[PDB]
Design an enzyme around this catalytic site. Structure first.
Site: not given
Ligand SMILES: O=C(CN(CCO)S(=O)(=O)c1ccc(-c2ccccc2)cc1)NO
Ligand SMILES: [Ca+2]
Ligand SMILES: [Ca+2]
Ligand SMILES: [Zn+2]
Ligand SMILES: [Zn+2]
Length: 161
Positions: A114-115, A118, A124
């Site tokens: 998820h990081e 990013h 998101h």
């Protein structure tokens, strides 16, 4: 198709760890997250230690005064940056937590993925199966863990058509 400053090749550096679990947990998590996008999009990466690579994954203990102090087993576990001239691909992990690889607590594999998403240039999403969902879903089904059309379109805009 519009990635980080139009660069197809990004280098990442491991500057974080885990006080609870082994090093396979953290190192392989960063690489599995980093390459999870490689298994989806034609991106090229390299893992090194020099000084500061494109993507820098560092640890953040209770002295985390750049955004939020240590919260322990709170709902917040990590934060990253992407569209910047300096903070390009740079993230932090809450050291004061139970970093795990089996969802036993703070899933560092899911969080890293998820990081990394990013840092690659994405925010998101909205789909529950999306890796970029704004909520850490306690999905014990690690055999069904994958990327969804939702987050797929996000990374596609970056390195795709
Ligand atoms: O997403 C975050 C951190 N968080 C706040 C988002 O509102 S969180 O609550 O700690 C968090 C942690 C993990 C995930 C997550 C991890 C893997 C897959 C899907 C979601 C989502 C939010 N930073 O970019
Ligand atoms: Ca927390
Ligand atoms: Ca950087
Ligand atoms: Zn930080
Ligand atoms: Zn997030």
């Amino acid at each position: 198709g519009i990635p980080k400053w139009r660069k197809t090749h990004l280098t990442y550096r491991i500057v974080n760890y885990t006080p609870d679990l082994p090093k396979d947990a953290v190192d392989s998590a960063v690489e599995k997250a980093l390459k999870v996008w490689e298994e989806v999009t034609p991106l090229t990466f390299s893992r090194l230690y020099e000084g500061e690579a494109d993507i820098m994954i560092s640890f953040a203990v209770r002295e985390h005064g750049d955004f939020y102090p240590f919260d322990g087993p709170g709902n917040v576990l990590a934060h990253a940056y992407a569209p910047g001239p300096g903070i390009n691909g740079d993230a932090h992990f809450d050291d004061d937590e139970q970093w795990t690889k089996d969802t036993t607590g703070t899933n560092l594999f899911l969080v890293a993925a998820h990081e990394i998403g990013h840092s690659l240039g994405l925010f998101h999403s909205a789909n529950t199966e999306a890796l970029m969902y704004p909520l850490y879903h306690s999905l014990t089904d690690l055999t069904r863990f994958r990327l969804s059309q939702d987050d797929i379109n996000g990374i596609q805009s970056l390195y795709g058509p």
